[model samples]
Target: GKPLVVVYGDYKCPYCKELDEKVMPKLRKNYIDNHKVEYQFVNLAFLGKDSIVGSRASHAVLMYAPKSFLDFQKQLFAAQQDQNKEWLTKELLDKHIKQLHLDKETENKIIKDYKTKDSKSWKAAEKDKKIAKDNHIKTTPTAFINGEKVEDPYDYESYEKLLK
Candidate 1:
């Protein structure tokens, strides 16, 4: 089986944004696109309400659209702002989801699922946070390759070497 690359992070984290915007492209092109590795993102939604909403939306996408989660993640990170600000509102998230041009039913399901508290998608986000906690993941942008946590998760070069 291909190595599984799991990243745990909060949507409101600047370090997470750095990895998402700068490092993931080359990594994806080399490994993910080539089917050399399988990638997963677990959201640690402990930052605030915005984090919870963003993670919930991601889980909803993963549940219904599956392939659309990465696009939704990219769009969400592209618009990331300071954690101090209230930016990831329902209006903005819904707008981004709409931009995907998914089927109307899928779009509605994603929106409705994320918007409701205790929905499966919403609980999935909480479960991710619990996983992070059990693993003692105290920081955003933590990475694991084939169940082994990287020593320097922020170092982009290590990902390629580890993948190899």
Candidate 2:
């Protein structure tokens, strides 16, 4: 396995949006797709309660609808709204989660797990938070390339230097 690059952030944060939409696409094309580096996402909810719901829902998707993860992550980021406001609505989830072609069993599993506060999916969220706190991560859009934190993750040049 290759060394992994990880970014920790909240779904409710706009800075996360720009990094994913702006910085990530190119990183994927240049490094990730080329197998130069492995990358991952870590979810956090330091913003608000809505952030918890968004992160939890994604955890649920990651466990239940594994095949739809890529599109689910894309859709979740694309549907992001202003912070401290509710962004995951019934209709929005219907389009993003339900319409992902999951059958009754898989779909029902995700919905049920998402509603359960003590589900493993929810526990995964807690794990991310604990990891962040233990590592003394005090920022929202925290990016860790390999084992080091990127001081300016928004800059394309910074990412290029790391990968190439």
Candidate 3:
């Protein structure tokens, strides 16, 4: 099937959370799960410093444990809510990994080798900032359904239209 939707947003953006928690579930249930559409979530870091931290941590998780990346993403967002911006620190990250029930040794290796092997993912996310700029994506939670921007993804009727 042809790709139907592409989501471009910052993982650290609260608005992005609104879409993830509020809108995406229904979309997944109704469309993606049924194999009627293909969805790709692209991370865009509009939050500058927080963006870099979150992106690096996400990349690290992807490298060591792609299966756990989603859990790590949730952990990072949950941590952000509590002003816990210690993703750069192994100790704090270990706490999150433990929360996700990940193996300690593997988590440690991810943190250790992040600067070497997984550096490219971080670079790619950063580079996407300029890509967003070029596309005039001023604010995050920006989405493209069938290559057209969905300016208001939260609107149920508007979103429903995109599925057709």
Candidate 4:
């Protein structure tokens, strides 16, 4: 069975990016990509407008190209800038989307959705706010494993034990 792992984060949060860069690879190899866990990332887009914009693009990827979502996610974190900055724009996100090598039409659609604020994808992104509120999550990079909150969000070693 694939255990459920839910991670709540914001695109602009530095610690979220830290966990993304350092811990996610291990989780990927040991659990997620290994097919031992079903990982879901919930966007808590409270940081700023930059967060909302980035979340829209991310959710667009999740909707249009689920298989490429992880690739887009990695690049999103890799390109993260200082907090509350105007670094996340449709233009910047298009560059990341292009690198996914999705079919050109799908890639363009993803960007167009971002630019046009397609109602469905934008709503999906905005829905995370309710998700966070309902879960009493007020911080970035919080995690739940198999319905229980992780004691230490950054503890990848412990996560392996749980996944096993």
Best by TM-score: 4
**Order of candidate numbers by TM-score, starting with the best:** 4, 1, 2, 3
TM-score of 4: 0.92
Greater TM-score among 1 and 3 belongs to 1
Question: What is each predicted model's overall lDDT from 0 to 1?
Answer: 0.85, 0.76, 0.65, 0.84
Candidate 4 lDDT, tens digit per residue, 76-116? 89998888687888788888989999999999888888667
| Least well predicted 10-residue stretch by lDDT in candidate 3 | 81-90
State the weakest 10-residue window (summed lDDT) of model 1.
149-158
Error of 2 at 153 (Å): 1.4
Query: What is the alpha-carbon lDDT of model 2 when measured against the actual structure?
Result: 0.76
Candidate 1 lDDT over 75-134, as tens digits, reads 788898888886789899899899889999989999999999899998998899888889
Going through the candidates in the order shown, the clash numbers are: 0, 0, 0, 0
- How should the candidates be ordered by lDDT, best one leading? 1, 4, 2, 3
For candidate 3, the TM-score is 0.70
Q: Give the per-residue lDDT of model 2 (tens digit) for 1-164.
A: 67588888888788888788877777777776677887677877788766677677788888887657656877688878877677765456655778677897887788778768889878887788887888788776878877777768887667777755
Candidate 3 C-alpha lDDT tens digits along 9-90? 7666777777776666577667765778776666666554556555665666776787666557656655555224423354
TM-score of each: 0.92, 0.83, 0.70, 0.92
Best model number under lDDT: 1
Q: How many backbone clashes are present in model 2? A: 0
Which run of 10 residues does model 2 get worst, by summed lDDT?
A: 87-96
lDDT of model number 1: 0.85
